[PDB]
Design a protein around this motif. Structure first.
Motif: not given
Lengths: 201, 125, 73, 180, 185, 272, 103
Positions: G26-33, G67-80
């Motif tokens: 799993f990778t951790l992604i921060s999305i723009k806003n 190619w990938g897929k978002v698949c669950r939120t992670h923590g409180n602060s909006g990381v996926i």
RNA sequence: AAUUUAAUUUCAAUAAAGCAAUCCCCUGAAAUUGUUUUCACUUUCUCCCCGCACUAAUGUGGGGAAAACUGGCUUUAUUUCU
RNA sequence: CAUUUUUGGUAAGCAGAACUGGCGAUGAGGGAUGCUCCUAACGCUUGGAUAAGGUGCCUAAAUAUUCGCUCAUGAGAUCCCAUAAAAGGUGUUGGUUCAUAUGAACUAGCCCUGAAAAUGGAUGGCGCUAAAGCGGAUUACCGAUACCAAGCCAUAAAAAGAA
RNA sequence: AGCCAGAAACCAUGCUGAUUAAACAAUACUAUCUUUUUUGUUUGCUAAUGUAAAAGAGAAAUUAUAUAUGUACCGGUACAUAAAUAAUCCUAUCACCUUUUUCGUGAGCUGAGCUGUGAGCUAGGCAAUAGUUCUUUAACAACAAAAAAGAGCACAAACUGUAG
């Protein structure tokens, strides 16, 4: 995070918090230009801070001070050492993060005309109680022998004269634009004018 | 990680390495179980020469099957190919390393007629 | 800023009758922060056509305004 | 309702008696109110009091009734006075405090928080002896007397706080403590 | 903890007061005094038309209450100073050698000579706004006067500290310059 | 345990590392501070050591045992051919130190100066300096004006005339001399007026003046620890020699501490 | 002007770490806003594209894509947490990632 | 994002009536456990008197009254006004 | 070797026992760091949800919420576990008992004094005072070779079989 | 809370080093060299590629924090102005060629006339069409070939001895 360069007016920021916030952004990959570090605040009384720093200065290797811990006395560099502490700098990814950060006292020329930001979480007034002492990093730096504080202050004053001239012109320019906009507002077709009006632009 | 292809899952690749063969020349590269009073590897320390064990084994309904999808059979004479006509869809011939080129050619020719795959096909020409 | 002159004791019925009567919410809406608040709520909720429409109108405004500035010299 | 400002301290009315025997045909029946984080906890605390005061344990007794009490008018202010017995590191003390709140439950929740803060009392170490609503003229502690003044008003002077949506890491200019 | 603390300070007849965001300023007959208070929480409010100053504190603690009293007294001293200057009378005492007091530099720099026969000069320059005059009356009196309650006292303290001896019994040897009388001009 | 008796350490720490100087020519580390009120004037002067003599001097000094009589004193002789000024330098103060703004040169520079900017004067085609030297006087004035407006310290580029000496070398010694005195304008005026002319010692000093002398010490190559640091010799009986220190540190900490002196370079040191 | 994005900007953070142990699945992604669990949840079903450049040609071109897929939120602060077909190479930490509109 | 019928001292408006004044829902303080009785507890953008602008306070410190707007109760309908 | 019980010894990472569990022969996750402490005992994998523990940065989770306390010119900060006492304090915070909105007397929280050691220097480090401190409470989250679901392997047993 | 004087202590100043900063500036002189355009970078060699960060990577007041900022008089006074501040503002899509008319700048001539280029108004009928997505090949920098346009030091050797 997503912009090319944050420029930070470090004035009124609390040392540790500013460093921690900067470090996380650096690690993620956001470039940071830290400017005007001398009015970084360390918390608490001046004498206490001086004494603590004096112990840090006192610390040296027995064998050969060339390979002793580097002390530094320059406020920007103090901030920088603190940021290094908050990154895993002996690693290679960490080393890149440390490199991404650039620090300087006062404001140099290519940063003169770019927007300074402030980090509100690390602003002093919102984090230290108003009966509990505080301390300017530049002052601390002068006391432990930096001796470049008066010069920076002279430079700040000079920049302010430039800034006030620019601002006065700018405010006047905003007035010209606003005046033209209101006048030529009623040259727009009704329907388009009404939509624009509806969202108050 | 796992190396899936179609019906063939093999769990592990990178052939298991005898501990310390990296850093002494005398230590042979092919596997050996470490004994040792205390030695990392027998003791299953984190991140060091992970010991093979049976559970890694290939699935029992696909145990030996080549990516050919046919079982390998080694052949050194045309008489030995007499059975494998009845399994031409599920076994594939390999011509034995020793076999000389005149004989080898004959074996390739017989196989082609018999409609069975020949894996080391271009050998010694 | 705004405040109503209500008694300390007050409960919900008296509060409804009073708040409506003296029209305090209207005063807040008329005030700048309230005005900005109502524009913001609309602006967030706005549909795809509306988003284009504001762009077209603003573009038209820019054309007229730029032309006037060019004239003005 | 807001979970963040929620507490779980309730009041339970408990009634119990001793199991009847040849010696005791009709036993002395005991009722008490007990402030607890749940009904089982309420029972346990009641049982501990039964062991400490009367001659009884859970094993040789029976519960007659267990019921939750909840405030009659939870949106009007009351001045609650509480008397506690607690244990310190040296020894044991009695003490009397006053609390402005909206229910008995609120008063106890604040009191546990206070006793932890000023006296390092853990929940184990606190024993409630009597809590009752006290008239405004009879208040004994200065900070409660100040609240009870005729035309209470004061300026707000607490720092801003706001949602995760706006608590961002970069800002246009320095925000202001001031407020209007 | 307590909700409200206040104090109400009358203003004398001659003063020109003018506060602004805890930068208090008082002007009057004998000069202008500025004295910052923006280190402190405090809701100073001004009242020029009917005179008086109101100091009011929100949500004090006893520390804050102490501060309110401290600010008001200090302000009252400032009014007192501009209305009628502070005169601190300092008598110069000698058992034996006659301590020679030479005032120069337009009532600045008092030079003190001949202390215990040391044949060396002790110079003590004054704080700004501080007159050092000599009495016309009793010969060993020396006047330290000014508008600022702080500066005159510090000047007096400096003079007092500058003189006194070392390594002799202070029970026996009393020579040196002391503060007699706190007055106004 | 503690050493049985105590002495100061041999040799000052304050000059370590005792390595060779970079350059034969001395360097001023720091100048006198610029008191504004005094006129513009030179602060330094370059000279050659010729030798020592003795002198006989009558002594005024009262309350001395020596008092009235003449005394005999050693003295040094330093030949001073008049310096020639060739350039003007303007420095400006930055938090990261002095940075040079610009330099303005005279309209000629002599061969003895020129030789220094080469290694091989005979072999060269001697093409250095000639085209910059040409550029017209408005250009020079523009740079001077820029210097005049902003610079906080002005220094003059001076050089020795070694042909007016008996010394072997013909590559001159160039050295910068800071000017202390009045307004920036006056400072600039004084250097401009001076410029291509020659400057003798009498313009820089006065009789009876007290002076600071900066020079590189006599070389000796690598010398033994005893000679280099003053260490007392070991007793005769000693098996592996005697002219060397008997300990170079305790067991802990487990490194040679720098402070113990060791054999090495002696002389060719900078000294003020 | 030309070729307007139609995708949300993002930054590839670390792997799905825990202290001193690594999982590359799993990778951790921060999305723009994005900034909260609730706000993040809106993107949960969406497609992810990591596009990157290489020095010499592959399929005749300099660009390839994982190619990938978002698949669950992670923590409180909006990381996926994002799962890709192939593990993301860790050298791409702090590089750009694209969160598309589809599906 | 919701949802069913229960259960557990829930409530709250609505709009017509009424009821009691330190009164009321409540809650205080008093004379082998019930129970009853005493006097204690509300508002106020009301009025009056002294302090007359005395305040942190677009008001106020003290001392008195007034009322039922406000609160509390009893009825009668009503629940998508809420 | 640890808890608990325990005998000798001034004590001892000392000597000797009792019960149980470990460790030894045992990884893995946590305790920064560690043979014994806590969690949990291990085939190979995929996804899920947790424990112990954390959630300012190093470092994955909160610069979370909520009420307190705390300024230290050698603060304080995590079982085992890595020192600190008797005695003081007109420091602040609560109490409690007395007297005529103050004087008395006690009390316990934090804090201060008491508090001295050798290579330089160690809350794990940077740091932190509207705490990232101390005492709570409230949530949400992150977090194992443990747990659940599923696949695959061997072992063990069981069903069950002579066009 | 606010302050002051005050020690062989502390830090400067001073002095030493500074391939301890893999640090750096100014200056003198010098080796086709520079610009634009084009195509390419799919005997050890003799054409030639790299990115820790392109997809609108938008945003120069300045000062507080128990108030700020302009402006006007003389830091005081008066009057405005900000006070969820980026929770904003800015800034993009109107292709094509043709018809009509208005306004800016570079270039040729001595404040004016003309052309190219930028912006607008008015009218026309005119283009896009790959069988469902598989990176939206789009940025920045580096290079090589091709045309077109413009332009001397150092080390050694001998010598030195202030050095070794």
């Amino acid at each position: 995070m997503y912009k090319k360069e944050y420029v930070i007016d470090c004035k009124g920021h609390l040392l540790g918090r500013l460093a921690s916030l900067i470090a996380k952004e650096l690690l993620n990959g956001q470039r940071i230009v830290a400017v005007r570090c001398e009015d970084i605040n360390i918390s608490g009384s001046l004498y206490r801070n001086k004494l603590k720093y004096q112990e840090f200065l006192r610390l040296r290797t027995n064998t050969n001070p060339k390979k002793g811990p580097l002390h530094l006395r320059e406020p920007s560099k103090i901030l920088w050492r603190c940021v290094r502490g908050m990154l895993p700098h002996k690693t290679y990814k960490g080393q890149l993060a440390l490199k991404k950060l650039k620090v300087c006292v006062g404001m140099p020329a290519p940063y003169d005309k770019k927007k300074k930001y402030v980090l509100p979480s690390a602003l002093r007034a919102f984090r230290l109680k108003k009966h509990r002492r505080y301390c300017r990093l530049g002052t601390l730096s002068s006391r432990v022998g930096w001796n470049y504080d008066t010069l920076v202050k002279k430079n700040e004053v000079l920049r302010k004269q430039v800034s006030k001239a620019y601002y006065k012109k700018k405010v006047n320019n905003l007035n010209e634009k606003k005046e033209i906009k209101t006048e030529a507002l009623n040259l727009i077709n009704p329907e388009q004018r009404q939509v624009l009006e509806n969202f108050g632009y | 990680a796992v190396k899936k292809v179609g019906k063939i899952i093999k769990k592990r690749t990178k052939k298991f390495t005898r501990f310390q063969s990296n850093r002494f020349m005398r230590v042979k590269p092919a596997w050996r179980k470490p004994r040792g009073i205390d030695c990392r590897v027998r003791r299953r320390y984190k991140g060091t020469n992970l010991m093979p064990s049976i559970g890694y084994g290939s699935n029992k309904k696909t145990k030996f099957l080549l990516p050919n999808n046919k079982y390998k059979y080694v052949v050194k004479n045309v008489k030995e190919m007499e059975p494998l006509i009845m399994n031409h869809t599920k076994y594939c011939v390999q011509i034995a390393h020793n076999v000389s080129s005149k004989k080898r050619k004959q074996i390739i020719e017989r196989a082609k007629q018999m409609n069975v795959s020949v894996i080391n096909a271009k050998a010694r020409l | 800023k705004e405040r109503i002159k209500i008694n300390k004791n007050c409960k919900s019925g008296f509060l409804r009758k009073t708040v409506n009567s003296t029209k305090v919410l209207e005063e807040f809406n008329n005030s700048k922060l309230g005005k900005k608040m109502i524009i913001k709520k609309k602006r967030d909720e706005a549909t795809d056509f509306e988003r284009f429409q504001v762009y077209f109108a603003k573009r038209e405004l820019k054309k007229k305004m730029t032309t006037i500035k060019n004239k003005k010299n | 309702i807001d979970n963040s400002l929620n507490t779980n301290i309730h009041q339970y009315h408990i009634v119990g008696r001793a199991i009847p025997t040849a010696k005791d045909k009709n036993p002395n029946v005991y009722r008490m109110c007990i402030f607890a984080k749940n009904d089982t906890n309420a029972k346990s605390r009641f049982w501990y009091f039964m062991k400490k005061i009367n001659k009884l344990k859970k094993s040789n007794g029976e519960l007659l009734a267990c019921e939750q009490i909840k405030e009659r008018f939870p949106l009007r202010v009351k001045n609650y006075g509480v008397l506690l017995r607690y244990d310190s590191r040296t020894g044991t003390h009695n003490m009397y405090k006053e609390f402005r709140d909206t229910t008995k439950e609120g008063a106890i929740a604040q009191l546990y928080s206070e006793m932890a803060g000023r006296h390092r009392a853990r929940a184990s170490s606190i024993n409630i002896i009597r809590i009752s609503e006290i008239s405004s003229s009879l208040v004994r502690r200065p900070h409660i007397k100040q609240l009870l003044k005729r035309r209470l008003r004061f300026p707000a002077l607490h720092l801003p706080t706001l949602q995760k949506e706006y608590r961002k890491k970069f800002a246009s200019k320095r925000p202001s403590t001031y407020r209007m | 903890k307590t909700i409200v603390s206040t104090q109400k300070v009358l203003i004398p007849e001659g003063v020109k007061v003018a506060i602004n965001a805890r930068k208090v300023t008082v002007s009057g007959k004998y000069g202008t005094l500025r004295r910052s208070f923006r280190h402190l929480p405090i809701d100073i409010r001004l009242n020029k038309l009917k005179k008086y100053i109101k100091v009011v504190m929100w949500f004090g603690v006893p520390d804050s209450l102490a501060c309110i009293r401290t600010v008001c007294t200090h302000l009252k001293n400032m009014f007192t100073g501009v209305t009628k200057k502070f005169l601190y009378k300092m008598r110069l005492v000698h058992a034996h050698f006659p301590i020679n007091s030479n005032i120069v530099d337009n009532n600045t720099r008092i030079e003190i000579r001949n202390y215990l026969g040391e044949k060396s000069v002790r110079f003590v320059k004054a704080l700004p706004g501080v007159v050092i005059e000599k009495s016309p009356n009793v010969k060993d009196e020396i006047y330290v006067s000014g508008a600022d309650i702080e500066n005159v006292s510090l000047t007096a303290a400096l003079i007092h500290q500058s003189v006194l001896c070392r390594n002799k019994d202070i029970r026996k040897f009393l020579d040196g310059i002391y503060v007699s009388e706190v007055t106004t001009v | 345990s503690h050493r049985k008796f105590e002495r100061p350490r041999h040799g000052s720490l304050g000059f370590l590392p005792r390595k060779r100087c970079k350059r034969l020519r001395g360097k001023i580390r720091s100048f006198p501070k610029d008191d504004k009120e005094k006129p513009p004037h030179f602060t330094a002067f370059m000279g050659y050591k010729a030798g020592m003599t003795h002198i006989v001097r009558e002594v005024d000094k009262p309350g001395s045992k020596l008092h009235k009589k003449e005394i005999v004193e050693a003295c040094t002789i330093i030949e001073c051919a008049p310096m020639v000024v060739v350039g003007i330098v303007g420095y400006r103060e930055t938090p990261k130190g002095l940075r040079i703004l610009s330099t303005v040169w005279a309209n000629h520079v002599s061969d003895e100066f020129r030789r220094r900017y080469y290694k091989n004067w005979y072999k060269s085609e001697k093409k250095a300096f000639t085209k910059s030297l040409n550029v017209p006087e408005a250009t020079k004035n523009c740079l001077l004006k820029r210097i005049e407006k902003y610079c906080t310290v002005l220094r003059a580029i001076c050089h020795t005339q070694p042909s007016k000496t008996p010394l072997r070398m013909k590559k001159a010694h160039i050295m910068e001399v800071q000017i202390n005195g009045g307004s920036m304008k006056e400072k600039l005026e004084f250097v401009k007026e001076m410029l291509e002319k020659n400057l003798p010692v009498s313009t820089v000093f006065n009789p009876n003046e007290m002076i600071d002398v900066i020079s590189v010490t006599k070389g000796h190559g690598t010398k033994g620890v005893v000679s280099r640091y003053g260490v007392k010799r070991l007793p005769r009986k000693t098996h592996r020699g005697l002219r060397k220190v008997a300990c170079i540190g305790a067991w802990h900490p487990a490194r040679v501490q720098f402070q113990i002196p060791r054999h090495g370079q002696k002389g060719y040191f900078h000294r003020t | 002007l030309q070729a307007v994005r139609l995708y949300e900007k993002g930054v590839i953070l670390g792997y799905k770490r825990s202290q001193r142990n690594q999982d590359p699945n799993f990778t951790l992604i921060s999305i723009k806003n994005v900034n909260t669990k609730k706000h993040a949840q809106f993107y949960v079903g969406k497609r992810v594209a990591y596009v990157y450049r290489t020095t010499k040609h592959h399929d005749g071109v300099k660009i390839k894509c994982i190619w990938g897929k978002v698949c669950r939120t992670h923590g409180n602060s909006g990381v996926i947490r994002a799962k890709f077909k192939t593990h993301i190479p860790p050298k791409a930490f702090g590089d750009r990632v694209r969160i598309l509109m589809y599906p």
